[PDB]
Design a protein around this motif. Structure first.
Motif, PDB file in Angstrom:
ATOM      1  N   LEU A 225      -6.371   3.680   7.142  1.00 20.12           N
ATOM      2  CA  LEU A 225      -5.201   3.488   8.184  1.00 20.12           C
ATOM      3  C   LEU A 225      -4.194   2.261   7.468  1.00 20.12           C
ATOM      4  O   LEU A 225      -4.728   1.323   7.357  1.00 20.12           O
ATOM      5  CB  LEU A 225      -5.805   3.216   9.442  1.00 20.12           C
ATOM      6  CG  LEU A 225      -4.631   3.024  10.820  1.00 20.12           C
ATOM      7  CD1 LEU A 225      -3.778   4.014  10.833  1.00 20.12           C
ATOM      8  CD2 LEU A 225      -5.312   2.368  11.936  1.00 20.12           C
ATOM      9  N   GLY A 226      -3.144   2.650   7.445  1.00 12.67           N
ATOM     10  CA  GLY A 226      -2.273   1.613   7.226  1.00 12.67           C
ATOM     11  C   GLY A 226      -1.633   1.775   5.839  1.00 12.67           C
ATOM     12  O   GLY A 226      -1.963   2.694   5.059  1.00 12.67           O
ATOM     13  N   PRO A 227      -0.462   0.919   5.450  1.00 12.80           N
ATOM     14  CA  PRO A 227      -0.029   0.977   4.125  1.00 12.80           C
ATOM     15  C   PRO A 227      -0.937   0.481   3.157  1.00 12.80           C
ATOM     16  O   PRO A 227      -0.396   0.607   1.851  1.00 12.80           O
ATOM     17  CB  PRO A 227       1.369   0.111   4.268  1.00 12.80           C
ATOM     18  CG  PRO A 227       1.093  -0.802   5.553  1.00 12.80           C
ATOM     19  CD  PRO A 227       0.326   0.017   6.413  1.00 12.80           C
ATOM     20  N   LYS A 228      -1.828  -0.297   3.451  1.00 14.68           N
ATOM     21  CA  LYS A 228      -2.893  -0.653   2.463  1.00 14.68           C
ATOM     22  C   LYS A 228      -4.241  -0.163   2.585  1.00 14.68           C
ATOM     23  O   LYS A 228      -5.256  -0.755   2.356  1.00 14.68           O
ATOM     24  CB  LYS A 228      -2.874  -2.164   2.626  1.00 14.68           C
ATOM     25  CG  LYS A 228      -1.586  -3.068   2.422  1.00 14.68           C
ATOM     26  CD  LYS A 228      -1.524  -4.405   1.886  1.00 14.68           C
ATOM     27  CE  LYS A 228      -0.466  -4.921   1.107  1.00 14.68           C
ATOM     28  NZ  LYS A 228      -0.790  -6.015   0.417  1.00 14.68           N
ATOM     29  N   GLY A 229      -4.223   1.139   3.012  1.00 15.38           N
ATOM     30  CA  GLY A 229      -5.202   1.885   3.039  1.00 15.38           C
ATOM     31  C   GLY A 229      -5.484   2.839   1.881  1.00 15.38           C
ATOM     32  O   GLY A 229      -4.367   3.331   1.366  1.00 15.38           O
ATOM     33  N   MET A 230      -6.797   3.280   1.415  1.00 17.67           N
ATOM     34  CA  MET A 230      -6.846   3.864   0.220  1.00 17.67           C
ATOM     35  C   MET A 230      -7.196   5.293   0.415  1.00 17.67           C
ATOM     36  O   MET A 230      -7.615   5.637   1.666  1.00 17.67           O
ATOM     37  CB  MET A 230      -8.101   3.103  -0.606  1.00 17.67           C
ATOM     38  CG  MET A 230      -7.703   1.778  -1.310  1.00 17.67           C
ATOM     39  SD  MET A 230      -6.173   1.814  -2.386  1.00 17.67           S
ATOM     40  CE  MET A 230      -4.908   0.941  -1.606  1.00 17.67           C
ATOM     41  N   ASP A 231      -7.625   6.002  -0.514  1.00 21.97           N
ATOM     42  CA  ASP A 231      -7.739   7.725  -0.284  1.00 21.97           C
ATOM     43  C   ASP A 231      -9.188   7.941  -0.559  1.00 21.97           C
ATOM     44  O   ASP A 231     -10.291   6.955  -0.836  1.00 21.97           O
ATOM     45  CB  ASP A 231      -6.914   8.461  -1.395  1.00 21.97           C
ATOM     46  CG  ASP A 231      -5.564   7.961  -1.711  1.00 21.97           C
ATOM     47  OD1 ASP A 231      -5.185   7.172  -0.656  1.00 21.97           O
ATOM     48  OD2 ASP A 231      -4.735   8.747  -2.223  1.00 21.97           O
ATOM     49  N   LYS A 232      -9.562   9.103  -0.237  1.00 24.94           N
ATOM     50  CA  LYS A 232     -10.790   9.343  -0.192  1.00 24.94           C
ATOM     51  C   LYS A 232     -10.963  10.682  -1.209  1.00 24.94           C
ATOM     52  O   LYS A 232      -9.990  11.489  -1.009  1.00 24.94           O
ATOM     53  CB  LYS A 232     -11.495   9.941   1.216  1.00 24.94           C
ATOM     54  CG  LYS A 232     -11.349   8.799   2.224  1.00 24.94           C
ATOM     55  CD  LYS A 232     -12.473   9.003   3.349  1.00 24.94           C
ATOM     56  CE  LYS A 232     -12.517   7.725   4.256  1.00 24.94           C
ATOM     57  NZ  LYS A 232     -12.156   6.483   3.781  1.00 24.94           N
ATOM     58  N   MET A 233     -11.990  10.912  -1.850  1.00 28.40           N
ATOM     59  CA  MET A 233     -12.322  12.170  -2.677  1.00 28.40           C
ATOM     60  C   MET A 233     -13.337  12.941  -2.106  1.00 28.40           C
ATOM     61  O   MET A 233     -14.427  12.568  -2.088  1.00 28.40           O
ATOM     62  CB  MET A 233     -12.446  11.871  -4.150  1.00 28.40           C
ATOM     63  CG  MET A 233     -13.326  12.700  -5.169  1.00 28.40           C
ATOM     64  SD  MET A 233     -13.883  12.141  -6.551  1.00 28.40           S
ATOM     65  CE  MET A 233     -12.514  12.464  -7.499  1.00 28.40           C
TER      66      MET A 233
END
Lengths: 55, 55, 58, 35
Positions: C33-41
């Motif tokens: 959540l948010g502009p500083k959140g990362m992705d999941k694979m």
């Protein structure tokens, strides 16, 4: 684990990051020896006996 | 934070691509056949047809 | 008040289990959540790989 | 007389940066069991 019944495996945090980096490094280490006018070639053999020579 | 690294990488890539256009050489300024031959011979180095580059 | 004894505890246990599962899912997807959140694979059992930040896809 | 096209360098830099960026963003892996 306990929560998130997923019948899979989950990895989180620096661990996975490090793992990812290592994978990339391994690929480079395969070809790093075939760069430039001095580097040499590679020989690849499959399960039945075909030979491929290339760099 | 990874976002800072990503933004820095993007900026560096853009500036490097912009700056490379100062290291260029126009091949019509050189003698065309010599430039073509040298480019081909440079590409051919490190291969099984290396020493035979001119032919 | 003085009476109305509750002789069954299964409903409370089931409610608590539901609460725990929902909170676990929320905590799992919190990090995106948010502009500083990362992705999941996600790697499917078949062998397909997806990299995503969308909540519904995850 | 050691020359190379500029497109090689340009495309290599662009593609490498894109790959590094797309891998640098993953913080969680989930691997499902085979069926």
């Amino acid at each position: 684990e306990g929560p998130l019944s997923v019948f899979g495996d989950r990895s989180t945090g620096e661990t996975i990051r490090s793992q990812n980096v290592m994978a990339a490094a391994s690929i480079a280490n395969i070809v790093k020896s075939s760069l430039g006018p001095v580097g040499l070639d590679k020989m690849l053999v499959d399960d039945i006996g075909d030979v491929t020579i290339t760099n | 934070h990874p976002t800072s690294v990503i933004s820095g990488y993007r900026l560096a890539c853009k500036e490097a691509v912009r700056y490379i256009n100062e290291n260029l050489i126009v091949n019509t300024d050189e003698l065309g056949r010599d430039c073509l031959i040298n480019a081909a011979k440079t590409s051919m180095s490190s291969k099984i047809i290396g020493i035979n580059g001119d032919f | 008040g003085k009476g109305a004894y509750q002789d069954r505890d299964k409903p409370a246990q089931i409610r608590f289990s539901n609460i725990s599962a929902a909170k676990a899912v929320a905590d799992a997807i919190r990090t995106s959540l948010g502009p500083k959140g990362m992705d999941k694979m996600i790697q499917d059992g078949k062998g397909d790989v997806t990299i995503t930040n969308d909540g519904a896809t995850i | 007389g050691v020359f190379e096209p500029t497109i090689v360098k340009v495309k290599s830099l662009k593609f490498a940066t894109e790959a590094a960026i797309t891998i640098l963003r993953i913080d969680d892996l989930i691997k499902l069991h085979p069926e």
